[PDB]
XYZ file of N, CA, C and O in Angstrom:
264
model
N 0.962 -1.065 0.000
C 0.000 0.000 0.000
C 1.027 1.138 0.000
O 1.593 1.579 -1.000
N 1.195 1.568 1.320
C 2.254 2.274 1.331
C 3.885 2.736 2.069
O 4.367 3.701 2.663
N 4.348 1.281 1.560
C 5.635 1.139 1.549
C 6.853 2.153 1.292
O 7.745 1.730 0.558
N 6.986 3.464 1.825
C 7.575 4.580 1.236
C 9.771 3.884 0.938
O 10.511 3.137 1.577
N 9.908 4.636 -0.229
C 11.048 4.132 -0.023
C 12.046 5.500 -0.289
O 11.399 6.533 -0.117
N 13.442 5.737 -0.661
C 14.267 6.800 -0.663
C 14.457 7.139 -2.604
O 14.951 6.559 -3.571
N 13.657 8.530 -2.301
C 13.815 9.123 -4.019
C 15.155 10.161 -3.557
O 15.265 11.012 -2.674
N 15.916 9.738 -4.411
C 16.578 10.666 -4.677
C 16.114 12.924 -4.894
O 15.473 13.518 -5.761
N 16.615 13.271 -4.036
C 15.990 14.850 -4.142
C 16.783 15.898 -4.707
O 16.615 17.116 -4.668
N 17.804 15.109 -5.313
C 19.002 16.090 -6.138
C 19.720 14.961 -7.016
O 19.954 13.816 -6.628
N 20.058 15.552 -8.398
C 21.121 14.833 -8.942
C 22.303 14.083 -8.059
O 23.220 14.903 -8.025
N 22.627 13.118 -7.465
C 23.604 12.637 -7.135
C 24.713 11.657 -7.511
O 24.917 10.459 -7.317
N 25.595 13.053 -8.370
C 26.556 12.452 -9.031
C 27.349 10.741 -8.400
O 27.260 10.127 -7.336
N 27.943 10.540 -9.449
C 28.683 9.295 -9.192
C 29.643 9.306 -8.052
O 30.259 10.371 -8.016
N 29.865 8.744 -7.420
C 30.899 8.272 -6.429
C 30.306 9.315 -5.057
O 30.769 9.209 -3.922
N 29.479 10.064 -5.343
C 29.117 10.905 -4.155
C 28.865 9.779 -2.836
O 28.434 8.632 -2.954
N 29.263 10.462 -1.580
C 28.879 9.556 -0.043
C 27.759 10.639 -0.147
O 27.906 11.797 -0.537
N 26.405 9.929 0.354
C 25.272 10.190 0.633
C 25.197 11.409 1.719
O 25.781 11.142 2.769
N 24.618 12.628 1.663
C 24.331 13.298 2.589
C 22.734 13.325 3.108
O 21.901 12.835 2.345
N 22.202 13.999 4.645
C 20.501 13.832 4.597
C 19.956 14.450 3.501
O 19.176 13.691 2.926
N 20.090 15.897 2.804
C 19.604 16.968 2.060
C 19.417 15.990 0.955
O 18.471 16.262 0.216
N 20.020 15.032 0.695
C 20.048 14.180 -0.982
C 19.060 13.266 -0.937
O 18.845 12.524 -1.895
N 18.193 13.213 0.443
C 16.971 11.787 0.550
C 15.849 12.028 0.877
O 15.551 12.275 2.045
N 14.691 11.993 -0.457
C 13.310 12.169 0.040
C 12.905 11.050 0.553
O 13.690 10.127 0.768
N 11.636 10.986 0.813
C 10.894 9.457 1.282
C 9.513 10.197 0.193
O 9.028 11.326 0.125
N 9.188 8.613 -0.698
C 8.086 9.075 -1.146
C 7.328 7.150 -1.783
O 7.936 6.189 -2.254
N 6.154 7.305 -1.539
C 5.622 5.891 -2.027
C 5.829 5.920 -3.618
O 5.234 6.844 -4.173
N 6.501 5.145 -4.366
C 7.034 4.846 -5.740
C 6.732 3.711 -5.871
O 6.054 3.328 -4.918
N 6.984 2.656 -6.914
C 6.437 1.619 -7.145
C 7.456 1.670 -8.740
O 7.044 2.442 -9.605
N 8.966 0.693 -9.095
C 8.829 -0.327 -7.770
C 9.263 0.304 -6.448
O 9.473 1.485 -6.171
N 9.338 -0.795 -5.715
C 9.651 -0.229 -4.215
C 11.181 -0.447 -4.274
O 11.681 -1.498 -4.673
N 11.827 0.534 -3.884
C 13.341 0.796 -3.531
C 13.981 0.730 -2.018
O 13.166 0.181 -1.277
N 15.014 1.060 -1.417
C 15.251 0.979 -0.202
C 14.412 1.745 0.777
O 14.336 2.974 0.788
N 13.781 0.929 1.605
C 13.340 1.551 2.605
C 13.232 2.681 3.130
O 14.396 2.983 3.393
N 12.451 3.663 3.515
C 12.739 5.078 3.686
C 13.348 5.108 4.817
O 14.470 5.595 4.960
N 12.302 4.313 6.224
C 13.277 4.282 7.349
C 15.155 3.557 7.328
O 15.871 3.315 8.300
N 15.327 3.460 6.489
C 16.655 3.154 6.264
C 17.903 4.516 6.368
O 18.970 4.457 6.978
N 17.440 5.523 5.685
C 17.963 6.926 5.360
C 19.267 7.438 6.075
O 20.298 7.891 5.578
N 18.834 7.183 7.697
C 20.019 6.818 8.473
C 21.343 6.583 8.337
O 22.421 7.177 8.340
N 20.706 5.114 8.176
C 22.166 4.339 7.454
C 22.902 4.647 6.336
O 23.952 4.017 6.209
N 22.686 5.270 5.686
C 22.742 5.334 4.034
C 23.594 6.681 4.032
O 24.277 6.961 3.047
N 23.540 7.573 5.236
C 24.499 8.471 5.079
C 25.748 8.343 5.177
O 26.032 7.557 6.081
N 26.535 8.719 4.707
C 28.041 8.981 4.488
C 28.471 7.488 3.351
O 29.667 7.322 3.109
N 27.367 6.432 2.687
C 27.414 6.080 2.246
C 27.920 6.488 0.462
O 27.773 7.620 0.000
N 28.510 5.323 -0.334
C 28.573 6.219 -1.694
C 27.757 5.489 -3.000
O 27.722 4.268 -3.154
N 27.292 6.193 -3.652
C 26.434 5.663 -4.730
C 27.181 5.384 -6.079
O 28.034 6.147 -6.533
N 26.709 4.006 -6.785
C 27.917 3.691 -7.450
C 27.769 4.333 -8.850
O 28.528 3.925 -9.729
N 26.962 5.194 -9.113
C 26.583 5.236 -10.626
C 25.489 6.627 -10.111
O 24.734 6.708 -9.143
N 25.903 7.953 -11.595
C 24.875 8.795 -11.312
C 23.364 8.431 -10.531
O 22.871 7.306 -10.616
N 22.759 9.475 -9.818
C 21.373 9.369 -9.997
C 20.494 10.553 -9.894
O 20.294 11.311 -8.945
N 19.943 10.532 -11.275
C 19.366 11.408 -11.550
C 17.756 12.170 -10.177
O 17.056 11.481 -9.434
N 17.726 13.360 -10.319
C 16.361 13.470 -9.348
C 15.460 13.052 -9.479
O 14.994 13.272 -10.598
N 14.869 12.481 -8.850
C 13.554 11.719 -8.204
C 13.675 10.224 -8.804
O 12.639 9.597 -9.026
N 14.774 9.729 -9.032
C 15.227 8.127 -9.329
C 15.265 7.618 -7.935
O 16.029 8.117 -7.108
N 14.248 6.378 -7.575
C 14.290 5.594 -6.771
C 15.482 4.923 -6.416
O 15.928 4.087 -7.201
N 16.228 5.224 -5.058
C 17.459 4.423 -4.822
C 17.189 3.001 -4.270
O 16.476 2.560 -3.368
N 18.170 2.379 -5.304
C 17.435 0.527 -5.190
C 18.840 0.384 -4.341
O 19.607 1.329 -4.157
N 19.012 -0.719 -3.939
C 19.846 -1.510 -3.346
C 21.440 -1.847 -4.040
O 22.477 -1.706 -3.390
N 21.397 -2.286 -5.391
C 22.290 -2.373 -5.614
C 23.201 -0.668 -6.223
O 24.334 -0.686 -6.704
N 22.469 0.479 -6.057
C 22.929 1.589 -6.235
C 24.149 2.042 -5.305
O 25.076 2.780 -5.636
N 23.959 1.496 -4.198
C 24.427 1.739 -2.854
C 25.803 0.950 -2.410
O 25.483 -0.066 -1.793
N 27.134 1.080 -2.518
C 28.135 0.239 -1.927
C 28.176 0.255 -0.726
O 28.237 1.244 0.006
N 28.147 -0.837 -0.446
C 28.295 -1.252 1.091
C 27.010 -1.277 1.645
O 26.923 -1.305 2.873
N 25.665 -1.270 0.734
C 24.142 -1.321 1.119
C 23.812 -3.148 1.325
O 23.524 -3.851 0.357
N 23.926 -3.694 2.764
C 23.433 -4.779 2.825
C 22.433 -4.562 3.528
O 22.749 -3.948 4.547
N 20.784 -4.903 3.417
C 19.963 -4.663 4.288
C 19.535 -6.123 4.763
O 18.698 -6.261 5.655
């Protein structure tokens, strides 16, 4: 129903470590990483551009084991 997961809220170039300002929560479909996750995911780095409002999936994320 509504499973919210993490949209991207700014271009986030390649190799960037994740900051909070870079993570919306919004219900999308498919479903991507968890919103309550967001936390974790900071100082994290993303392996490949992502464009705004691209759902961050799992394998986007190095070092994302949930």
């Amino acid at each position: 129903a509504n499973q919210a997961s993490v949209v991207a809220n700014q271009l986030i170039p390649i190799n960037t470590a994740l900051t909070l300002v870079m993570m919306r929560s919004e219900v999308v479909t498919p479903v991507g990483i968890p919103a309550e996750d967001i936390p974790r995911l900071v100082g994290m780095q993303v392996n490949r551009a992502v464009p705004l409002g691209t759902t961050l999936m799992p394998d986007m994320v190095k070092g994302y084991a949930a």
